[PDB]
């Protein structure tokens, strides 16, 4: 799995 | 932008 | 912005 | 799992 | 910015 | 920018 | 696991 | 696994 956000 | 997670 | 959690 | 927030 | 933790 | 973690 | 924050 | 953030 993964978790990704823009910043 | 975006935010993405596996589930 | 955003806020994300697994559940 | 995960927890993610913008800041 | 951001804040991220495993769970 | 970005923030990414495995899960 | 991990914990990460911008500063 | 991994954890990566821009700075």
- Residues A6, H5 contacting (CB under 8 angstroms): no
Q: What is the resolution of this structure in A?
A: 1.0
Tokens for B7, please give them.
Answer: 């589930």
Question: How far is Cα D3 from Cα G1, in angstroms, rounded to an integer?
Answer: 12
Tokens for B4, please give them.
Answer: 């993405």
Residue F3 bridge partners (DSSP):
A5, H5
User: Structure solved using which method?
Assistant: X-ray
Task: Give the 3-state secondary structure of residue B1.
Answer: coil
F contacts of D5 (beta carbons < 8 Å) = none
Chain centre to alpha carbon of residue F1: 10
Please indicate whether, in this complex, the C-beta atoms of D5 and E3 are within 8 angstroms of each other: yes
B contacts of D3 (beta carbons < 8 Å) = none
Nearest Cα neighbor of F6 from D7, B7, C4, A2 is A2
């Amino acid at each position: 799995g993964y978790v990704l956000g823009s910043a």
